[PDB]
Design a protein around this ligand. Structure first.
Ligand SMILES: [Cl-]
Ligand SMILES: [Cl-]
Ligand SMILES: [Cl-]
Ligand SMILES: [Cl-]
Ligand SMILES: [Fe+2]
Ligand SMILES: [Fe+2]
Ligand SMILES: [Fe+2]
Ligand SMILES: [Fe+2]
Ligand SMILES: [Fe+2]
Ligand SMILES: [Fe+2]
Ligand SMILES: [Fe+2]
Ligand SMILES: [Fe+2]
Ligand SMILES: [Fe+2]
Ligand SMILES: [Fe+2]
Ligand SMILES: [Fe+2]
Ligand SMILES: [Fe+2]
Ligand SMILES: [Fe+3]
Ligand SMILES: [Fe+3]
Ligand SMILES: [Fe+3]
Ligand SMILES: [Fe+3]
Ligand SMILES: [Fe+3]
Ligand SMILES: [Fe+3]
Ligand SMILES: [Fe+3]
Ligand SMILES: [Fe+3]
Ligand SMILES: [Fe+3]
Ligand SMILES: [Fe+3]
Ligand SMILES: [Fe+3]
Ligand SMILES: [Fe+3]
Ligand SMILES: [Mg+2]
Ligand SMILES: [Mg+2]
Ligand SMILES: [Mg+2]
Ligand SMILES: [Mg+2]
Lengths: 160, 161, 160, 161, 160, 160, 161, 161, 160, 161, 161, 160
C-alpha cells in the first residue's frame, strides 16, 4: 500500500569528482601507513620503545582508514587505486628519509606527515560534505583519529 | 564563585511530530529489510549459495541494530515508535519480497533493490532530521554508510567484468 | 563390504503438512519477536529497566527460535515464509497495543503473547513428533525456553 | 525422618548387546563421514571452492564431536566402541568417496549423499535406541538435526531456481 | 487475520504429582552436589588430583541441574523446596561418610551416589514424559551428563 | 610527483573561544560523573538495584566523554582544566544533594542534571560546528548517549 | 648449601582442634546461606522480581566460593570440613527459610537477616582465628566485606527515606 | 533447628561516626587524586610523554576503583559517603595540581607528592579503622600497596643513580 | 623497472616422489588420530583420567598435523588420500587392539604408535628436505610435538 | 666454580651487506603483494565475489605480518629496511596489478601469479640466507609455507575438474 | 585550599633495613622454590606423572608471581631486592633438590618439604613485617594461603588412609 | 597391509654430547631470566617504564625458552639441570650487578647478556643440527626471539 512498485530501485552513485576527492584521501592514508612502518622499524634513540609502539598504533589507524575510504568509494560505485606506483606518484606527503633516524627527528617528521594527511582530508571536506554528508562523517572520524595521533606523537618533543 | 543553575526541573529535547514521523518512516523500512533479509537468507539456492546466505545474516544484524537505534532515539526524544507487523506491512516503502525459493542471482538483485529503497528513505528524511537535530542525522549517516556497504558486498556477485 | 552402492541416496523429506505445522510455529515466533521489541521500546514506569532488559532477552530467544525453525524447514526441504504480510495475516497472537504502556500492563500483555506462542507449539507438537522426533526436540527447547521467559516476566505482577 | 537408600553398591544402567551394536553402527558412519569430509575439504576444486572448503570443515567438526558423543555414550552404558580404521572401512554403510580432485559440483552431490547415508543409519536405529533408552535417542536427535542442516548448507549450491 | 481474541491466555500448569516428581529429582541433585563437594575436599591418596578435579566437574553439573529442575518447576507453577532440612529428610542417596577417604573409596562411594541420583530420574521419567515431553528432555540431559560423570569417575577403579 | 615541500607542516589549532566552549562541556561532564557516582552509592528504596546499576553506566559514559573532550582540546592545542576547584566553581549543573535519597528522587534529580549537561553541549554546538565539524561529531555522540541515559533513567518515574 | 636446611621431613602448619571447629562454624553457615539464597532465588515473586532474582544468584555465587575457600583452608591446615546436608541442617545458626512463594519485600528482609547471621558467625570467630593464624583471618575479612556488600545491595530495596 | 537462631530481625555491623569520618577522609583524597591524575594525563608534555600519559591512566583506574570500594564499604556499614566536587575541593589534603601544560619531569614530582599525600591519609586513619573493623583495614592495605606501587612506577623516571 | 613482465608466473610444483613421501606421513598421522581416540574411549584403571585427557591432546595434535600435511600437499599441487581404506591398507602403525585396556597397557601401546609415526617422518625427512626445506620445517614441528606427546604419555610407566 | 664470561661488551650477530640486500628483496615484494592484495580486495567483481574478497584480506594480513617480520629481522641483525612507496614501486619484481575493476576469474589468476612471484623471490634468496643465518631461513620457510597456502586457497577457484 | 597541604615534596613510606632484610629472605626462598618446582616439573617420572607435572607448574606460576610481588613491594618501600642465581643459591633456606629423574612418590615428599620450608620463612618474618607495615603482612598472608594450598594439593597424593 | 610388526618401537634418543649441548643452552636461558627480573625490578631513571616493561617481555620469552629446551631434553631421554647452584656455577653470562642501575646502564648490561645467551645457542647450533634438525628449529626460534629483544632493548642507547 505504501510499497514502491519498481523492481529496479537504483542506489546513490558518487560523481566522478567525489570519487577523485576520496582517491586523494586514500593515497595519503596509504602513504602515511607506509611511512609509519618505515619510522616504526628505523627509529632509534632516547624513548625508542614508546615511539616504536605509538607508530604501530598510527599505522593501524591509517590502514583501517584507507580500507574505510576505499570501501566507501566502492559502496558508491567509485573505484579506488591504492597501487604503489599511484601512491608514490600522487601522494602529497613529503618523502620519508632513508636510514636510521633519532626519536626526536622521527617525532618531527611523522607529525608533519600526519598533518599533511589531515590537510588533504580538510581540503576535500566541504566538497565531499556537499554531495554526501554520510561520507563527511567518515572524514570527521579520520580527522579526529589522526589529530589525536599527531598530539600523542609530537608531545614527546614539546618543551614547556 | 558559582555558575550552577537553580532550576529543579530541567527539560530534555522534545522532537516535533514531523521529526517523529520521519524517524518512524526509517524504522518500518529497517524492520521490513530485516524480515526480507531473513526470508532471503533461508530461501536462496544455487551458485554461491553459502556466501549470500552468510552475507544476508550480516545485513539482518545491521538492520536490526539500526531499527533498535532509531526506535530508541525516538524514545529519547519523547516520540513513540511503532514496529508492529501490521504497521510495518501497511507502511513500508520496500517492494514485497517474493515467496518461495529464489536463485542466488535473483536474491542479489532483489535484496540490493530493497537496501537501495531503505537507504532512499533515510536520504529522503535526512535534511529535515539534520535541521531539527544534527545528533540524530549522525545516526542516519551510520545507517546510510553501513547499508550501502552491505549493498556493495551483496550486489558485486552480479556485476560483470 | 557393508558399503551401500547407490550414488544417489536421498535424505528425509518433510511432508507438506509437516512444513505447514512448522510454518505455524515460525510466524508466531516472529510475531512474538516484533511484539517483544515494541514492548522493549515503549514500556514505562515502576521497574522499567528490568522489563526493558528482560524483553530483549525474550526477543533474543524468539529470534534464535525462528531461525532454528525456518532452517529446520529448509533442512527437510520445506520453504519458510517470514515476510511481514504473512506474519500479520497468519499469526495467532493477539495484537500488541500502540503507544507507551506501564510495566504492569506490559507484563500481562507479554505473558499472554508468550503463552499464545507456546500454545501453538504444543498444538502442533504431536503431529510433528509422529513424523520427525528430532524436530519435536527443537520444539521442546522452544517450549522450555519460552515458558521460562513467561515465568521470569509474569513474576513481577504476582502478589502473594 | 529419612528416605535414604541403604545399598552400598548401586549399579548403573547397562546397555543390551543389541543397543551397543546399534550405537556402533552410528559410530562407524560418523567416523567415515569425518574422514570423507576431510578428503573432500582438501581435494575440492572449481567454482565456489572456498565456501565448500570451509563448509566441509564445519561438517567434519560436527561429525567428530558426534562420534565422540556416541562412543562415550557407549562407554557410559558399559558398551565398547570400535573406531579403528580397519573396522570403519570394513563396516561403514557409506559409499566410498572417490580418489583425487573432484569438482565443486561433484563434491556437493557426493558429500550430500554421504550425509544422507549417515543420517539414514541414525534414523534406522532410532526406534530401537529410543525404546531401550530415551536419553540416548535425544543424542541421536541432535546428530540428525545437525547433519541434516549440514546437508542443506552443502547441497543448496547445486539446487537450481 | 488468524489473531486470537483472549486477553488472558494462561500457561501450562503441572499436576501436584508432576511437581512432586520434579521435587524428588531436585533433592537428589542437591544432595549429590553437597556430597560431591564433601568428596572433593576430603579425598586423599593415589591419583588425588584427578579425582579432586573431576568431582568439581560433577558438582558443577549437578548444581546447573538442580537450578534447571527448580526453574522448570517455577515455569510450570510448581514450588521447589531445596532447603537443607528437606534435602536431608527426603533424599534417597546413601549418606556420604565424614572424614578423609581414599581415592579408591571415593570412586566407589560417589559412583554409587551418582547411580542413585540417575535412578531417581529414571524412576520418574515415564510419568514426567506422559504429562510434559519438554520436561523429559531436561531429564534426558541429566541422565546423559550424570551417567557420563559415573563413567569418568568409576573407570579409575576398573581392573583390566 | 605531487609531494609537498614543507618540512614543518602545522596542524589545525582551535581559537580561544573554541577551547572555552569545549572547557564548558568538560566541566559539566566531570560534574555529572561525580554526581552520578554520588547517586550510585546513596540511592535507596524501590528498584534500588536497577538504578544503582544504570547510574554506573551513566558514569562510564560521562567519564569516556570527558576524556574524549579533553583529548580533543589537546589535539587542537587547547588546554583542559578538570580540577575539582574549577569543576565546582564553573559547572552549570544544579548541585546534587548529600545523604541517602529515594529511587524516585534520584530519578528526578539525575534526569535534571543529565538534561543540564546536554543543554551545555547543545548551547555550544553551532559555534563548535562552524569552526570544526569533526569536533561537532564528538558532541553528537555525547548528546545521543546522554539523552539515551536520560530516557533509561527517567522512564522509572513515568506514569501510564 | 650455606643457609640450606638439611631436614628430610619439614612439616606444615597444623590447625588446632579449636581453630578447625571455628572454621567449621563458618563453613556450615556459608553452605546454609547458599541453599537459602537459591530457595529465595527460585521462589521470590512480585514487585522488582528480576533484580532480586539476579542479586540472589550473585549472593549464592559468593557464598559458594566462600565455602570452598574455607573448606580448602581447613584441608591445607590438616582440618577436616563437614559440609553434608544433615550436618548443615543440624548445626547452622541461620533462622530457617520459609517454604513456598514469598514476596520480594519479605525475601529482602528474610535474606538480609540470614546474611547478617552468617557475618555474625565470622565476626564471632574472628579474633580466635586471627590469634592462631593471621593468614586465615584475611580470608574471613574477604567474606565479611563480600557478604556485608550483598546485605547492603539486597536490603536497600526495602529502605524508605 | 538445633543451633538455629529464632530472631526475625538480625541487624548488621554499623560503623561509628568516627569510623565513617575516617573513611570519608580516604574517599575525598582518592577522588582528588583521580581528578589530578587525569589533569596530568591530559596536560603532560615532553621527554617520555607516552609512558607517563599511559601510567597516569593506570593510576586513575586504581584510584577510581579505590574510591568506589571505600564509598561502598561505607554504604555496607551504614555510613554515607560524600564524593561531590565542592566537598572534595573543600576537604582534600592533597596540594593543588597546577594549571596548564607541565613537563614530564615536573609531572613525575607533582604526582609522586600527591600519591604520597593520599597514602599518608590512609596510613593516618589505619590504626583507628583496624581497631574498629579489621575487614576494612584490609581494604586500606590493598590501597596502600596499590598506590605505593604507582608512586614507585612514576617516580623512578626522575631518579638519577 | 625491476617488475617481471610475464603474466603467467608458475609456482613451485612438488614432484610425485615428494607427494608420495608426504602421503606416507599423512596416513600415519590419521591412523594415530584414530588409534588415539580408540585409546581415549577404552582406557580403564589406575590414573584413567590423566590418560583420557592426554590422549585427546595427542589426537588434537595429530589431527592438526594431518591437516597441515594434506594442505601442504595441496599447496604444492600434490593430492592427498586420507580415506579409511587407504589409511588401513597403507599405515605402518601396528594395529590398536580391540576392547577395554588398562592404563599401563594403553601407555605402552600408544608410545609405540607415536614412535612409529615419528619414525615415518624421520624416514622421509632427508628426501623432503632436499626438495623443499620449508616442508621439512613442518616435519620438524611434527617430530617435536609428537616426541613431546611420547614423553608425556610414557612417563606414567617409567620406574626409577 | 664459575664459567662466567668477563667481557663487558659482547657484540650481536651482524648481517653482511649481501644478506641485508637479500632480505630487502623479500621485503619490497611482500609490501607490493600487500598493496596489490588490497587493490584486488576492493576491486574484484563477479561470480563468487565474497569468497575472494574475504580470502584476499587474509592474504594481505599474512603479507603484512611477513613484511614486519623481515624488516624487524633486518633491524635485529644491524641492517636497515626500506619499505617506502618509491622504493617498493622502483624495485619490486612483481608484475604491476592492473587498474580498475577485474573479474573474479581474472583476480584469481592475477593474484596467484603475484604470490608465485613473491615466493620465487624468497626461494631465490633462500640458500644464501640459510648459509649465513639458519634462523632467518626459518622465517623464510614460514613465509613460503603461508604464501603457497594462500596461492592454493585463491587459485583453486579457477581449477577445473 | 581549606584542608590542602602546602608541601612541595611529600616523601613516601620507607622500609627499615630490618624490614628490607626480612622481605629479601622471603624473596630468595620463593625464587628457589620456583627453580626447584621447574626441576621437579621436568624430571618427575612414574605413577600419576601428568597430575604432578601439571600441579608443579601451577606451584611455579604462584611462586613466580609471589617473588615479583615481594620484590616490587621492596621497590615501592625503597628497598632493593637481589634475585640473582648466586645470591639465591648462597642464601636460600630450602634443602637442595636432587639431580636426575625422580619418582612421583619422591617428588611429592621432596616438594611438600620445600614448600613447607618456604612457608616457614614467611611465617618466621611475619610478626616483624606486620609490626612495621600491616599492608605488607597482607601480601605475606596471600603467599602463606596460596603455598599451603599447593602443599595440600601435592602431598595428598602420598596419603594413605 | 603395510603395518609394522614390533610391539616395543623405541623413540629417538640423544647422545650425551647432544644433551650436554642443550644443558648449556638451558643454564644461560635460566640465568638470563633471573637477570632479566633483577633488571626489571632495579632499573631507574630516564625512560624507566619502557625498560621495566620490555624486560618483563624478555623474561617471559626466556622462561618459555628454558621450558622448551628442558622438555626437548626430556623428550630425547636427556635430563635437564636447572637448579640454582648449577645455573650459578655453569652459566657463561657475565654477572649482573646488584643494586639500582640507570636505564642507560641496564640497556648496555642486558644487551651484553642477551648477546652472551645467543652466542651459546649459536655455538652449539651446528652440532645440534647435525644430530637432530628438529631441535635446531627450536634453537632458531630462540636466536630469532632473543636477537629481537636485543634490538628492542639496545635501540634506546643508539645515537643518531
Ligand atoms: Cl565465508
Ligand atoms: Cl540487571
Ligand atoms: Cl607501553
Ligand atoms: Cl588434569
Ligand atoms: Fe554534520
Ligand atoms: Fe555529522
Ligand atoms: Fe522423545
Ligand atoms: Fe526427546
Ligand atoms: Fe534435547
Ligand atoms: Fe559520528
Ligand atoms: Fe589483613
Ligand atoms: Fe634447516
Ligand atoms: Fe629449519
Ligand atoms: Fe591484620
Ligand atoms: Fe588480602
Ligand atoms: Fe620453525
Ligand atoms: Fe576490508
Ligand atoms: Fe534495545
Ligand atoms: Fe542463520
Ligand atoms: Fe572425548
Ligand atoms: Fe538461575
Ligand atoms: Fe585517555
Ligand atoms: Fe575447590
Ligand atoms: Fe559501584
Ligand atoms: Fe583446514
Ligand atoms: Fe612491528
Ligand atoms: Fe613486574
Ligand atoms: Fe611445561
Ligand atoms: Mg528492578
Ligand atoms: Mg618511554
Ligand atoms: Mg562463495
Ligand atoms: Mg592422575
Amino acid at each position: 500500500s505504501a510499497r514502491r512498485t519498481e523492481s529496479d530501485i537504483q542506489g546513490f552513485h558518487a560523481t566522478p569528482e567525489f570519487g577523485g576527492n576520496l582517491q586523494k584521501v586514500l593515497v595519503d592514508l596509504i602513504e602515511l601507513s607506509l611511512q609509519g612502518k618505515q619510522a616504526h622499524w628505523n627509529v632509534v634513540g632516547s624513548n625508542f620503545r614508546d615511539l616504536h609502539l605509538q607508530l604501530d598504533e598510527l599505522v593501524d589507524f591509517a590502514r583501517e582508514g584507507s580500507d574505510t575510504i576505499a570501501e566507501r568509494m566502492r559502496a558508491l560505485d567509485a573505484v579506488p587505486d591504492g597501487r604503489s606506483d599511484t601512491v608514490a606518484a600522487t601522494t602529497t606527503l613529503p618523502e620519508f628519509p632513508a636510514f636510521e633516524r633519532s626519536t626526536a627527528d622521527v617525532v618531527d617528521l611523522i607529525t608533519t606527515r600526519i598533518n599533511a594527511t589531515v590537510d588533504t582530508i580538510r581540503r576535500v571536506h566541504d566538497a565531499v560534505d556537499a554531495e554526501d554528508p554520510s561520507t563527511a562523517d567518515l572524514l570527521h572520524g579520520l580527522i579526529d583519529g589522526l589529530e589525536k595521533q599527531a598530539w600523542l606523537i609530537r608531545s614527546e618533543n614539546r618543551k614547556v
